Amino acid sequence: ADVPAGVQLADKQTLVRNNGSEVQSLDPHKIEGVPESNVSRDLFEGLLISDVEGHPSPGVAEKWENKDFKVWTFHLRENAKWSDGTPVTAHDFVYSWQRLADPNTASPYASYLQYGHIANIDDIIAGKKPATDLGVKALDDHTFEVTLSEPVPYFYKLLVHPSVSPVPKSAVEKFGDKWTQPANIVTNGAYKLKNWVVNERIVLERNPQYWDNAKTVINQVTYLPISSEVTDVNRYRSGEIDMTYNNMPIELFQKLKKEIPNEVRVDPYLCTYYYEINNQKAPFNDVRVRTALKLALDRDIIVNKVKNQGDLPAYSYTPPYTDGAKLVEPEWFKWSQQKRNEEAKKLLAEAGFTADKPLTFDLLYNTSDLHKKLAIAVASIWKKNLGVNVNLENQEWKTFLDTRHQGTFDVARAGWCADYNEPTSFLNTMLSDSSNNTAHYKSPAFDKLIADTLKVADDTQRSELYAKAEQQLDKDSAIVPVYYYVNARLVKPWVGGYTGKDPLDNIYVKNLYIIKH
Ligand SMILES: [U]
Ligand SMILES: [U]
Ligand SMILES: [U]
Ligand SMILES: [U]
Ligand SMILES: [U]
Ligand SMILES: [U]
Ligand SMILES: [U]
Ligand SMILES: [U]
């Protein structure tokens, strides 16, 4: 943390953050979500990290070079250490990226290595080559070299993500799935795991072996798994929570804005809220049905009437303010809702649905006040506007993500937040073979457009192909865009160091501090 001159620090430097749900895991290769990543940044540090405003910055690597954007060489700081006092080396990264690529690990982020185009990754994911053929090597203990199959000018931006953090081989090998328990875990971030009570709390304590430990101010942070946004706000206002999770409740937000304006942080956020359609399950494999659901949803009502938290109505998957996004707003978004409703009803009748035989399906969401209230409003709107019947189902976060990967659903509430600020951080998740494709969308034309983005050496041509890829997704109605999120949360006045400037919201508790109050 960088404490400003004259700030008086509190005697006790402890922090309580709500984290939205129980984490899937603490293993960097087994996670895919925001809650998971929130805890992961405090425990495991990759090559680069985000600074307090979100800029890619030195992590374990203190400096790096690239040759033609294809060979990237990272110089690891000599004092980087794990919490057991042993050095973090380039060998740790070689093992870790291999474990990520290895199909036996079944990481949800195995494709992150395809997004960066690390040599031989396609064959490794397919089982054609062993994970040891991955295009990474330790040139010495403090030098990690990555070789890509084509120039990727933004490659380094990918490296602040948890999937490319190191994991301790000896703990993984000796303890297997229990390597993340407090007694067994080894970590190289600013914190160490002290306690993990499932569905109660995760408690982290400062790691004295962290290379930049002298700048760490918070001594202990607790992450809570509260999925009720109303409850989160309640325990923040009671004094227990210092920073809520950034999912705000419809019940109280209007009131909070007027009651505690200075505590309500509302900043840009590169995330899109949408209804994910299972594209491989009839009748959702018919474009007419998917298009009807997309058009009959009234975003103005959801965004401005039912939620009204500053969100913008969405017409694409990639947020239009992503660095590199130059998207074409489709004609259907400019129409009136009445015109969208007629078009929707017309495609539905063409797909064989009648009043006698209506379209009935499930709408899966993860437990939450926000998601439930939004799903109830969406069910009503689709019933009223299009004649479809929806059966709402809630699941806890970890189960919900597994259900979407399994494909055991019809429509699911969904939200993707950028991992790096560039349109492919969204677009690559819709590739046919992406480990993150929970839409189960497979379009050879979409795949080709993205493939072509690294075959040109022009950002103008790249941006045009990204727009065309969004247009292909849209013409196929792969998803139902709802709104672009804003990052809205409550932060006590005494919590210093949270700028709200990073649109990826990659917060590190090592950057924060408690002002005397
Ligand atoms: U004190
Ligand atoms: U106190
Ligand atoms: U650049
Ligand atoms: U940029
Ligand atoms: U269903
Ligand atoms: U509620
Ligand atoms: U460039
Ligand atoms: U106090």
Curated annotation (Swiss-Prot):
UniProt cross-references to SUPFAM superfamilies, sorted A to Z: Periplasmic binding protein-like II
Domain of life: Bacteria
Disulfide bonding pattern of the chain: C271-C417
Molecular function GO labels: peptide transmembrane transporter activity
Keywords: Disulfide bond, Peptide transport, Periplasm, Protein transport, Signal, Transport
Cellular localisation: Periplasm
Family that this chain belongs to: Belongs to the bacterial solute-binding protein 5 family.
Entry domain remark: Accommodates the ligand side chains in large hydrated pockets which impose little specificity on binding. Tight binding is achieved by utilising the hydrogen-bonding potential of the main chain of the ligand.
Note: Isothermal titration calorimetric measurements of the binding of lysine-containing peptides of different lengths to OppA show that the dipeptide Lys-Lys is bound with 60-fold lower affinity than related tri- and tetrapeptides (Lys-Lys-Lys and Lys-Lys-Lys-Ala, respectively).
Function as written in the Swiss-Prot or TrEMBL entry: Part of the ABC transporter complex OppABCDF involved in the uptake of oligopeptides, including the cell wall murein tripeptide L-alanyl-gamma-D-glutamyl-meso-diaminopimelate. Plays an important nutritional role and is involved in the recycling of cell wall peptides. Binds peptides containing from two to five amino acid residues regardless of their sequence. Also binds cell wall peptides, such as L-alanyl-gamma-D-glutamyl-meso-diaminopimelate.
Protein name (database record): Periplasmic oligopeptide-binding protein OppA
Organism: Salmonella typhimurium (strain LT2 / SGSC1412 / ATCC 700720)
Source organism phylogeny: Bacteria, Pseudomonadati, Pseudomonadota, Gammaproteobacteria, Enterobacterales
Gene name of the encoded protein: oppA
